[PDB]
RNA sequence: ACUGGCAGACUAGAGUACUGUAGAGGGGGGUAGAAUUUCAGGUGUAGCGGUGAAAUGCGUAGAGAUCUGAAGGAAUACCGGUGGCGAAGGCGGCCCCCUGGACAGAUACUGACACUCAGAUGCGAAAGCGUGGGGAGCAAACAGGAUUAGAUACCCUGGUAGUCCACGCCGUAAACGAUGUCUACUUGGAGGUUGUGGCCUUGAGCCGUGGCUUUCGGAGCUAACGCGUUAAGUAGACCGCCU
């Protein structure tokens, strides 16, 4: 939800504004049906990455 | 020490669009968070918060 | 549940000389206190020492000799799920006579070479070597 | 026996029935070696969503200590009372006899 | 769900001394009381297989307990029967 | 001496009592909000829907869109988490009722009451089966439309059993950590979570002490990959199993 308090601000306010309640995000999701095993398989590829990132990006010469 | 009555805390813990903060965001401790969720969905179920920015 | 204290104590001397502990502690118990007193007499342990009245607690003091351990091999023999008594005309050698096995016999607790010599046999607790 | 917090919400145009409820609900409990710790009428409050299309309605908040029968009796009241819209009861570890958040506004 | 009153009740009753909470007397009728209670429940709740479970655990200690006491007094062992009704 | 027996003794194992704590643990009942579908009415007027494109389909008998209402069923956005709980399977809105387990602190108690378990018994995802209900959405089968050489498929439009409830049955899954249970011992680093004590809370903190859990690694182990105090290390008890 915007009010328009000039337009083009007002759109990007919107985006934003609906960005950050995660709306096409969710339509996104709920557009097919996401079996529970692989939303499960997906969420433990994304935290094991995320680790393994920030582990060799502590290990993280180059020149 | 949170109550499904003191809304004006628990608003600070609700976005806009009437949804649950993440306790990442808020920094609230786990055992916190578990206590506002539990609290939040007692206040809106009172109306006393709204369940979404819609209804 | 901990079935056989023998071998934990032997474990635990085990353990402890792989990690290079100086003493180890472990619950006594009369028999735990036999095998130190022996594992002392044959120079494979520096002393022991037992703590405690209520509950007395045993620490052996572990040997080392140009930074290796003393003990190289603690193999316990008679298991609680498999008893072995032996003759003594078929007391083992161990290491090549080099290593003591450990038996209980009738007289005590004491090696093998002393058992021979004693002409008794009885139960093998362990190989030390 | 249990202490619990009952908050119901009664219907706007009732409002004038609303202090004869208070009576009457905490007269069963009061009755059934019932405690009321707190009562507290938040009075009419605007309702975060439509409630029957309703847009206020008329909060009461009590806080007894009872026996689970008394409470059962006031949850099947509650129930057929077609002015009294929502009820949470809600059992506490230990009696309130403060006063709320609510009230302290 | 036996409380502590209930509890106490029991503990005193089949104490084998002063403060006596940890005989098998004590333990077995605590236990022989919550079983008791518990039948209630689920006969109530057929489906509840998961507190089963738990009754069952208390159950299976009851034996163990009464075993441990037939092997040690048989007289008490043959007491703590009677005054529970354990047709053991 | 050691194992056993017998008669005692002991409190470290195991258990009990007390008080707390966290928790999608289980069972029962109720209820809320969002959304979908159908339906009724209002507005409105030629599309809608679908796809790679399209067609089937829907729409002038008024669809789709939009507003309002109604009725149903199912599932609970956010919170939400390499978070939590449970023997495992598994468990997610909120409220109540019934109920299991774990954990911590403190004191007292019992006195080896233990561990493992052939056979046995019980629990056991989803599908399936029986009976009776229920049936929004989804969808085996099936129908039609496309694609193709063909298309008994993938894609699209539909769609039934099933999915949901009650009470049974079935007993199986990559039921997985592809890792039996129990016990003890053996360098560390960084986290999460749930107790507890102390300090000056001198200021959200810091330091101890428990439970559970994640990750990285040392020795060691391993064919290697890797495992690494939650072992796949060092040992013990017992079971299952391989050839």
Redesign the interface.
């Known amino acids: 939800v915007v009010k328009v308090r000039p337009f083009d601000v007002a759109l990007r306010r919107f985006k934003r504004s609906c960005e950050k309640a995660g709306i096409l995000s969710e339509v996104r999701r709920r557009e097919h049906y996401e079996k529970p095993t692989t939303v499960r398989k997906r969420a433990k590829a994304a935290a094991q990455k995320r680790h393994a990132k920030k582990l060799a990006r502590e290990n993280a010469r180059l020149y | 020490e949170i109550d499904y009555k003191d809304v004006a805390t628990l608003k600070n813990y609700i976005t806009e669009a009437g949804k649950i903060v993440p306790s990442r965001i808020t920094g609230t401790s786990a055992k916190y968070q578990r206590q506002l969720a539990r609290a939040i969905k007692r206040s809106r179920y009172l109306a006393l918060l709204p369940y979404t920015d819609k209804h | 549940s901990m079935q056989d204290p023998i071998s934990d104590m032997l474990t635990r001397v085990r353990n402890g000389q792989a990690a290079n502990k100086v003493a180890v502690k472990m619950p006594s118990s009369k028999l735990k206190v036999a095998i130190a007193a022996l594992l002392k007499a044959e120079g494979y342990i520096v002393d022991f020492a037992v703590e405690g009245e209520a509950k007395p607690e045993l620490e052996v003091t572990l040997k080392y000799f140009q930074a290796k351990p003393v003990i190289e091999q603690l193999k316990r023999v008679s298991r609680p799920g498999l008893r072995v008594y032996k003759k003594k005309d078929q007391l083992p050698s161990v290491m090549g006579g080099l290593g003591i096995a450990i038996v209980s016999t009738s007289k005590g607790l004491m090696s093998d070479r002393a058992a021979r010599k004693a002409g008794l046999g009885g139960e093998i607790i362990c190989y030390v070597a | 026996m249990r202490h619990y917090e009952i908050?119901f919400?009664v219907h706007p145009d009732q409002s004038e029935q609303v202090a004869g409820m208070i009576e009457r609900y905490t007269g069963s409990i009061t009755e059934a070696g019932g405690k009321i710790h707190r009562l507290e009428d938040w009075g009419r409050?605007q309702?975060?969503?439509?409630?029957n299309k309703l847009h206020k309605?008329h909060?009461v908040?009590m806080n007894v200590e009872a026996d689970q029968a008394v409470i059962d009796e006031l949850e099947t009241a509650f129930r057929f009372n077609d002015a009294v819209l929502?009820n949470?009861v809600?059992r506490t570890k230990a009696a309130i006899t403060e006063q709320?958040?609510?009230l302290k506004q | 769900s036996l409380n502590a009153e209930t509890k106490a009740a029991i503990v005193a009753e089949y104490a084998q001394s002063e403060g006596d909470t940890g005989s098998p007397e004590v333990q077995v009728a605590l236990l022989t009381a919550s079983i008791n209670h518990l039948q209630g429940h689920f006969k109530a709740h057929k489906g509840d297989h998961h507190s089963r479970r738990g009754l069952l655990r208390m159950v299976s200690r009851r034996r163990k307990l009464l075993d441990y006491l037939k092997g040690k007094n048989l007289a008490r062992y043959q007491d703590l029967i009677k005054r529970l009704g354990l047709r053991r």
């Open positions: 908050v919400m409050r309702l975060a969503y439509p409630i309605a909060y908040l929502r949470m809600m709320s958040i609510m």
